[PDB]
Short mmCIF file of all heavy atoms in Angstrom, two decimals:
data_model
loop_
_atom_site.label_atom_id
_atom_site.label_comp_id
_atom_site.label_asym_id
_atom_site.label_seq_id
_atom_site.Cartn_x
_atom_site.Cartn_y
_atom_site.Cartn_z
N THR A 1 52.95 -0.31 -19.37
CA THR A 1 51.86 0.66 -19.48
C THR A 1 52.27 1.91 -20.25
O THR A 1 51.58 2.92 -20.17
CB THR A 1 51.36 1.05 -18.09
OG1 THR A 1 52.44 1.58 -17.31
CG2 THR A 1 50.77 -0.15 -17.37
N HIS A 2 53.38 1.86 -20.99
CA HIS A 2 53.81 2.98 -21.81
C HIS A 2 54.62 2.44 -22.98
O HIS A 2 55.30 1.42 -22.85
CB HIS A 2 54.65 3.98 -21.01
CG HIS A 2 53.87 4.75 -19.99
ND1 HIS A 2 53.50 4.21 -18.78
CD2 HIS A 2 53.38 6.01 -20.01
CE1 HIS A 2 52.82 5.11 -18.09
NE2 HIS A 2 52.73 6.21 -18.81
N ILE A 3 54.54 3.13 -24.11
CA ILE A 3 55.25 2.75 -25.32
C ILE A 3 56.09 3.93 -25.78
O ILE A 3 55.57 5.04 -25.94
CB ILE A 3 54.29 2.29 -26.43
CG1 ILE A 3 53.46 1.10 -25.93
CG2 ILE A 3 55.05 1.91 -27.69
CD1 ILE A 3 52.41 0.62 -26.90
N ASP A 4 57.38 3.69 -25.99
CA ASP A 4 58.33 4.73 -26.37
C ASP A 4 58.57 4.66 -27.87
O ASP A 4 58.89 3.59 -28.40
CB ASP A 4 59.64 4.56 -25.61
CG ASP A 4 60.70 5.55 -26.04
OD1 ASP A 4 60.48 6.77 -25.89
OD2 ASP A 4 61.76 5.10 -26.52
N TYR A 5 58.41 5.79 -28.55
CA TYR A 5 58.53 5.82 -30.01
C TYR A 5 59.94 5.54 -30.49
O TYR A 5 60.13 5.29 -31.69
CB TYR A 5 58.06 7.17 -30.55
CG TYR A 5 59.02 8.31 -30.31
CD1 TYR A 5 59.82 8.79 -31.34
CD2 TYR A 5 59.13 8.91 -29.07
CE1 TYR A 5 60.70 9.84 -31.14
CE2 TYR A 5 60.01 9.95 -28.85
CZ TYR A 5 60.79 10.41 -29.89
OH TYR A 5 61.67 11.45 -29.68
N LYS A 6 60.94 5.57 -29.61
CA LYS A 6 62.32 5.29 -29.97
C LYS A 6 62.67 3.81 -29.80
O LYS A 6 63.84 3.44 -29.99
CB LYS A 6 63.27 6.15 -29.14
CG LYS A 6 62.97 7.64 -29.21
CD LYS A 6 63.95 8.47 -28.39
CE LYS A 6 63.47 8.67 -26.96
NZ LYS A 6 63.38 7.41 -26.19
N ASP A 7 61.70 2.97 -29.44
CA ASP A 7 61.93 1.54 -29.26
C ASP A 7 61.68 0.81 -30.58
O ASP A 7 60.72 0.05 -30.75
CB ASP A 7 61.04 1.01 -28.14
CG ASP A 7 61.41 -0.39 -27.71
OD1 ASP A 7 61.90 -1.17 -28.56
OD2 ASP A 7 61.20 -0.73 -26.53
N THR A 8 62.58 1.06 -31.53
CA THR A 8 62.38 0.59 -32.89
C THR A 8 62.27 -0.93 -32.95
O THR A 8 61.49 -1.48 -33.74
CB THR A 8 63.52 1.07 -33.79
OG1 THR A 8 64.77 0.62 -33.27
CG2 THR A 8 63.51 2.58 -33.89
N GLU A 9 63.05 -1.64 -32.13
CA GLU A 9 62.97 -3.09 -32.13
C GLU A 9 61.57 -3.56 -31.75
O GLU A 9 61.02 -4.47 -32.38
CB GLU A 9 64.02 -3.70 -31.19
CG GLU A 9 63.93 -3.30 -29.72
CD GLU A 9 64.52 -1.94 -29.43
OE1 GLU A 9 65.03 -1.30 -30.37
OE2 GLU A 9 64.48 -1.50 -28.26
N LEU A 10 60.97 -2.94 -30.73
CA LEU A 10 59.62 -3.31 -30.34
C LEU A 10 58.61 -2.95 -31.43
O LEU A 10 57.71 -3.74 -31.72
CB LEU A 10 59.25 -2.63 -29.02
CG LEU A 10 57.98 -3.12 -28.32
CD1 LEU A 10 58.02 -2.77 -26.84
CD2 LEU A 10 56.73 -2.55 -28.96
N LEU A 11 58.76 -1.77 -32.04
CA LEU A 11 57.80 -1.37 -33.07
C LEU A 11 57.87 -2.28 -34.29
O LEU A 11 56.85 -2.50 -34.97
CB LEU A 11 58.05 0.08 -33.47
CG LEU A 11 58.00 1.11 -32.33
CD1 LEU A 11 58.05 2.52 -32.88
CD2 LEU A 11 56.76 0.91 -31.47
N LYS A 12 59.05 -2.82 -34.60
CA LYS A 12 59.18 -3.74 -35.72
C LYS A 12 58.32 -4.99 -35.51
O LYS A 12 57.93 -5.64 -36.48
CB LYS A 12 60.64 -4.14 -35.92
CG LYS A 12 61.53 -3.02 -36.46
CD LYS A 12 61.19 -2.64 -37.90
CE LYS A 12 61.49 -3.77 -38.88
NZ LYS A 12 62.91 -4.21 -38.81
N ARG A 13 58.02 -5.33 -34.26
CA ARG A 13 57.17 -6.49 -33.99
C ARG A 13 55.79 -6.31 -34.61
O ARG A 13 55.25 -7.23 -35.23
CB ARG A 13 57.06 -6.71 -32.48
CG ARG A 13 56.06 -7.78 -32.07
CD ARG A 13 55.93 -7.89 -30.55
NE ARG A 13 57.09 -8.53 -29.94
CZ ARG A 13 58.17 -7.90 -29.52
NH1 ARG A 13 58.29 -6.58 -29.63
NH2 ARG A 13 59.16 -8.59 -28.97
N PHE A 14 55.21 -5.12 -34.45
CA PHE A 14 53.85 -4.86 -34.90
C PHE A 14 53.79 -4.19 -36.27
O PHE A 14 52.69 -4.02 -36.80
CB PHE A 14 53.11 -3.99 -33.88
CG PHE A 14 53.14 -4.54 -32.50
CD1 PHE A 14 54.15 -4.21 -31.62
CD2 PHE A 14 52.14 -5.40 -32.07
CE1 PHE A 14 54.18 -4.73 -30.35
CE2 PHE A 14 52.16 -5.92 -30.80
CZ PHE A 14 53.18 -5.58 -29.93
N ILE A 15 54.91 -3.79 -36.83
CA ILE A 15 54.91 -3.25 -38.18
C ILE A 15 54.96 -4.39 -39.19
O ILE A 15 55.50 -5.46 -38.92
CB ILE A 15 56.07 -2.25 -38.37
CG1 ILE A 15 55.75 -0.95 -37.62
CG2 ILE A 15 56.30 -1.97 -39.85
CD1 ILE A 15 56.89 0.02 -37.55
N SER A 16 54.38 -4.15 -40.36
CA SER A 16 54.32 -5.15 -41.42
C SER A 16 55.65 -5.24 -42.15
O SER A 16 56.59 -4.48 -41.90
CB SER A 16 53.19 -4.82 -42.39
OG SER A 16 53.24 -5.66 -43.53
N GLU A 17 55.73 -6.20 -43.08
CA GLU A 17 56.94 -6.34 -43.89
C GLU A 17 57.18 -5.10 -44.74
O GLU A 17 58.32 -4.65 -44.89
CB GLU A 17 56.84 -7.59 -44.77
CG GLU A 17 57.07 -8.90 -44.02
CD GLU A 17 55.97 -9.20 -43.02
OE1 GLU A 17 55.00 -8.41 -42.94
OE2 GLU A 17 56.08 -10.21 -42.30
N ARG A 18 56.11 -4.54 -45.31
CA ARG A 18 56.22 -3.33 -46.12
C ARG A 18 56.19 -2.06 -45.29
O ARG A 18 56.30 -0.97 -45.86
CB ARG A 18 55.09 -3.29 -47.15
CG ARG A 18 55.19 -4.36 -48.23
CD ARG A 18 54.04 -4.24 -49.21
NE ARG A 18 54.14 -5.20 -50.30
CZ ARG A 18 53.27 -5.31 -51.29
NH1 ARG A 18 52.20 -4.52 -51.36
NH2 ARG A 18 53.46 -6.22 -52.24
N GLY A 19 56.05 -2.16 -43.97
CA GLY A 19 56.05 -1.01 -43.10
C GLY A 19 54.68 -0.58 -42.60
O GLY A 19 54.60 0.34 -41.78
N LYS A 20 53.61 -1.21 -43.07
CA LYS A 20 52.28 -0.87 -42.60
C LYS A 20 52.07 -1.36 -41.17
O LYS A 20 52.69 -2.32 -40.72
CB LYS A 20 51.22 -1.49 -43.51
CG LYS A 20 51.41 -1.16 -44.98
CD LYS A 20 50.16 -1.46 -45.78
CE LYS A 20 50.34 -1.09 -47.24
NZ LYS A 20 49.09 -1.26 -48.03
N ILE A 21 51.18 -0.67 -40.46
CA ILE A 21 50.84 -1.06 -39.09
C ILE A 21 49.89 -2.24 -39.15
O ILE A 21 48.82 -2.16 -39.77
CB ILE A 21 50.22 0.12 -38.32
CG1 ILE A 21 51.19 1.30 -38.30
CG2 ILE A 21 49.86 -0.31 -36.90
CD1 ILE A 21 50.68 2.52 -37.57
N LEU A 22 50.28 -3.34 -38.52
CA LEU A 22 49.45 -4.54 -38.55
C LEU A 22 48.15 -4.29 -37.79
O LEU A 22 48.16 -3.63 -36.75
CB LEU A 22 50.19 -5.72 -37.94
CG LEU A 22 51.48 -6.14 -38.66
CD1 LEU A 22 52.18 -7.24 -37.88
CD2 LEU A 22 51.20 -6.58 -40.08
N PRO A 23 47.02 -4.80 -38.29
CA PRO A 23 45.76 -4.58 -37.58
C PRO A 23 45.72 -5.24 -36.22
O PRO A 23 46.40 -6.24 -35.95
CB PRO A 23 44.71 -5.19 -38.52
CG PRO A 23 45.47 -6.06 -39.45
CD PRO A 23 46.82 -5.45 -39.59
N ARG A 24 44.91 -4.65 -35.34
CA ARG A 24 44.78 -5.14 -33.98
C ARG A 24 44.26 -6.57 -33.95
O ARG A 24 44.72 -7.39 -33.15
CB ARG A 24 43.84 -4.21 -33.20
CG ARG A 24 43.55 -4.64 -31.78
CD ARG A 24 42.20 -4.12 -31.33
NE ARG A 24 41.82 -4.67 -30.03
CZ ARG A 24 40.63 -4.49 -29.47
NH1 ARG A 24 39.69 -3.77 -30.05
NH2 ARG A 24 40.39 -5.04 -28.28
N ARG A 25 43.28 -6.89 -34.81
CA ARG A 25 42.72 -8.23 -34.80
C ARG A 25 43.74 -9.28 -35.21
O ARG A 25 43.54 -10.47 -34.92
CB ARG A 25 41.49 -8.29 -35.72
CG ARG A 25 41.81 -8.66 -37.16
CD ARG A 25 40.59 -8.50 -38.04
NE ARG A 25 40.43 -7.12 -38.49
CZ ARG A 25 40.97 -6.62 -39.59
NH1 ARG A 25 41.72 -7.36 -40.39
NH2 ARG A 25 40.76 -5.34 -39.90
N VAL A 26 44.81 -8.87 -35.87
CA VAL A 26 45.88 -9.80 -36.25
C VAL A 26 46.95 -9.86 -35.18
O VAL A 26 47.40 -10.95 -34.81
CB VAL A 26 46.47 -9.38 -37.61
CG1 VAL A 26 47.72 -10.19 -37.92
CG2 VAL A 26 45.44 -9.56 -38.71
N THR A 27 47.38 -8.71 -34.66
CA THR A 27 48.45 -8.71 -33.66
C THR A 27 47.98 -9.16 -32.29
O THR A 27 48.82 -9.49 -31.44
CB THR A 27 49.06 -7.31 -33.54
OG1 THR A 27 48.03 -6.35 -33.28
CG2 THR A 27 49.79 -6.93 -34.82
N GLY A 28 46.67 -9.18 -32.03
CA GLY A 28 46.15 -9.57 -30.74
C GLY A 28 46.15 -8.49 -29.69
O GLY A 28 45.66 -8.72 -28.58
N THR A 29 46.66 -7.30 -30.01
CA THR A 29 46.78 -6.25 -29.01
C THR A 29 45.40 -5.69 -28.65
O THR A 29 44.43 -5.82 -29.39
CB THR A 29 47.68 -5.12 -29.52
OG1 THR A 29 47.05 -4.47 -30.63
CG2 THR A 29 49.03 -5.66 -29.95
N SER A 30 45.33 -5.06 -27.48
CA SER A 30 44.13 -4.37 -27.06
C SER A 30 43.99 -3.05 -27.82
O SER A 30 44.95 -2.54 -28.40
CB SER A 30 44.15 -4.12 -25.56
OG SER A 30 42.99 -3.42 -25.14
N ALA A 31 42.77 -2.51 -27.84
CA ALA A 31 42.55 -1.23 -28.50
C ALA A 31 43.28 -0.10 -27.79
O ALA A 31 43.88 0.78 -28.43
CB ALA A 31 41.05 -0.93 -28.57
N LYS A 32 43.23 -0.10 -26.46
CA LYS A 32 43.90 0.93 -25.67
C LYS A 32 45.36 1.06 -26.08
O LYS A 32 45.84 2.16 -26.37
CB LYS A 32 43.78 0.59 -24.19
CG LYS A 32 44.47 1.57 -23.26
CD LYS A 32 44.16 1.26 -21.81
CE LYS A 32 44.72 2.32 -20.89
NZ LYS A 32 44.32 2.09 -19.48
N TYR A 33 46.07 -0.06 -26.13
CA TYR A 33 47.48 -0.03 -26.49
C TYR A 33 47.70 0.02 -28.00
O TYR A 33 48.78 0.42 -28.44
CB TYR A 33 48.19 -1.24 -25.89
CG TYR A 33 48.05 -1.30 -24.38
CD1 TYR A 33 47.13 -2.15 -23.79
CD2 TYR A 33 48.82 -0.49 -23.56
CE1 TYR A 33 46.99 -2.20 -22.41
CE2 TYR A 33 48.68 -0.52 -22.19
CZ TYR A 33 47.76 -1.38 -21.62
OH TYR A 33 47.63 -1.42 -20.25
N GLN A 34 46.69 -0.34 -28.80
CA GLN A 34 46.80 -0.18 -30.24
C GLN A 34 46.88 1.30 -30.61
O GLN A 34 47.63 1.68 -31.52
CB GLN A 34 45.61 -0.85 -30.93
CG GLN A 34 45.65 -0.82 -32.45
CD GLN A 34 46.68 -1.77 -33.03
OE1 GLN A 34 46.89 -2.87 -32.52
NE2 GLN A 34 47.34 -1.35 -34.10
N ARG A 35 46.11 2.14 -29.93
CA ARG A 35 46.21 3.58 -30.15
C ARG A 35 47.61 4.09 -29.82
O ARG A 35 48.23 4.82 -30.61
CB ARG A 35 45.17 4.32 -29.31
CG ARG A 35 43.75 3.89 -29.59
CD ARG A 35 42.77 4.57 -28.64
NE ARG A 35 41.65 3.70 -28.34
CZ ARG A 35 41.27 3.34 -27.12
NH1 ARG A 35 41.84 3.84 -26.03
NH2 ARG A 35 40.28 2.46 -26.98
N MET A 36 48.13 3.71 -28.64
CA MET A 36 49.48 4.10 -28.26
C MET A 36 50.49 3.64 -29.30
O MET A 36 51.41 4.38 -29.66
CB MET A 36 49.84 3.49 -26.90
CG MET A 36 48.82 3.72 -25.80
SD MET A 36 49.50 3.30 -24.18
CE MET A 36 48.01 3.22 -23.18
N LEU A 37 50.33 2.41 -29.79
CA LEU A 37 51.25 1.86 -30.77
C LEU A 37 51.22 2.67 -32.06
O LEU A 37 52.27 2.96 -32.64
CB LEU A 37 50.89 0.40 -31.05
CG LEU A 37 51.66 -0.30 -32.17
CD1 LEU A 37 53.14 -0.36 -31.83
CD2 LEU A 37 51.09 -1.68 -32.40
N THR A 38 50.02 3.02 -32.54
CA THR A 38 49.93 3.79 -33.77
C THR A 38 50.60 5.15 -33.62
O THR A 38 51.34 5.59 -34.51
CB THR A 38 48.46 3.96 -34.18
OG1 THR A 38 47.63 3.18 -33.32
CG2 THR A 38 48.26 3.52 -35.61
N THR A 39 50.36 5.82 -32.49
CA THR A 39 50.99 7.12 -32.27
C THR A 39 52.51 6.99 -32.21
O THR A 39 53.23 7.81 -32.79
CB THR A 39 50.44 7.76 -31.00
OG1 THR A 39 50.36 6.78 -29.96
CG2 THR A 39 49.05 8.34 -31.26
N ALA A 40 53.01 5.97 -31.51
CA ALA A 40 54.45 5.77 -31.43
C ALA A 40 55.05 5.49 -32.80
O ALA A 40 56.13 6.00 -33.14
CB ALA A 40 54.76 4.62 -30.46
N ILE A 41 54.37 4.67 -33.60
CA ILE A 41 54.87 4.34 -34.93
C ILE A 41 54.93 5.57 -35.81
O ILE A 41 55.88 5.76 -36.57
CB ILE A 41 54.01 3.22 -35.55
CG1 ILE A 41 54.23 1.91 -34.80
CG2 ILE A 41 54.33 3.07 -37.03
CD1 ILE A 41 53.26 0.81 -35.17
N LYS A 42 53.91 6.43 -35.73
CA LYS A 42 53.93 7.65 -36.54
C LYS A 42 55.02 8.61 -36.07
O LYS A 42 55.68 9.26 -36.89
CB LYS A 42 52.55 8.30 -36.51
CG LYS A 42 51.49 7.46 -37.22
CD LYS A 42 50.08 7.98 -37.01
CE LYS A 42 49.06 7.06 -37.67
NZ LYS A 42 47.66 7.54 -37.49
N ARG A 43 55.24 8.69 -34.75
CA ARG A 43 56.36 9.49 -34.25
C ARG A 43 57.69 8.99 -34.81
O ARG A 43 58.53 9.78 -35.27
CB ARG A 43 56.39 9.43 -32.72
CG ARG A 43 55.34 10.28 -32.04
CD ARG A 43 55.25 9.97 -30.56
NE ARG A 43 54.48 10.97 -29.84
CZ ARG A 43 54.08 10.86 -28.58
NH1 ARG A 43 54.33 9.77 -27.87
NH2 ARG A 43 53.40 11.86 -28.02
N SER A 44 57.90 7.67 -34.78
CA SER A 44 59.14 7.11 -35.29
C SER A 44 59.28 7.36 -36.78
O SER A 44 60.38 7.68 -37.27
CB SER A 44 59.21 5.61 -34.99
OG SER A 44 57.95 5.00 -35.19
N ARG A 45 58.19 7.22 -37.54
CA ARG A 45 58.25 7.53 -38.96
C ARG A 45 58.69 8.97 -39.18
O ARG A 45 59.54 9.24 -40.03
CB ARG A 45 56.88 7.30 -39.61
CG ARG A 45 56.55 5.85 -39.87
CD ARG A 45 55.17 5.72 -40.48
NE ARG A 45 54.80 4.33 -40.75
CZ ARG A 45 53.57 3.93 -41.01
NH1 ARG A 45 52.55 4.77 -41.03
NH2 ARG A 45 53.35 2.64 -41.26
#
């Protein structure tokens, strides 16, 4: 129920080959956690 922006290995799962954030409809994630994921990815960037 929480996503840590320092969990680079986990973020690599949902990041694209070129570094873009994969869309929710492709990754299968929920919208609630897709927001958390985007914020964590931007923090890590």
Side-chain angles (χ1 to χ4, degrees):
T1 58
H2 290 78
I3 301 176
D4 176 62
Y5 74 103
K6 306 181 269 64
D7 191 330
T8 57
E9 60 280 359
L10 192 159
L11 303 189
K12 290 292 294 303
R13 173 184 286 90
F14 306 90
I15 287 171
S16 171
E17 284 66 3
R18 293 180 177 180
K20 307 195 178 186
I21 302 180
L22 298 175
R24 177 207 172 187
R25 90 189 84 89
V26 171
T27 54
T29 66
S30 179
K32 179 173 186 175
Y33 302 101
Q34 183 73 38
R35 302 175 213 124
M36 310 193 195
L37 174 63
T38 353
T39 44
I41 291 170
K42 293 171 183 180
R43 285 169 167 170
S44 41
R45 283 178 180 166

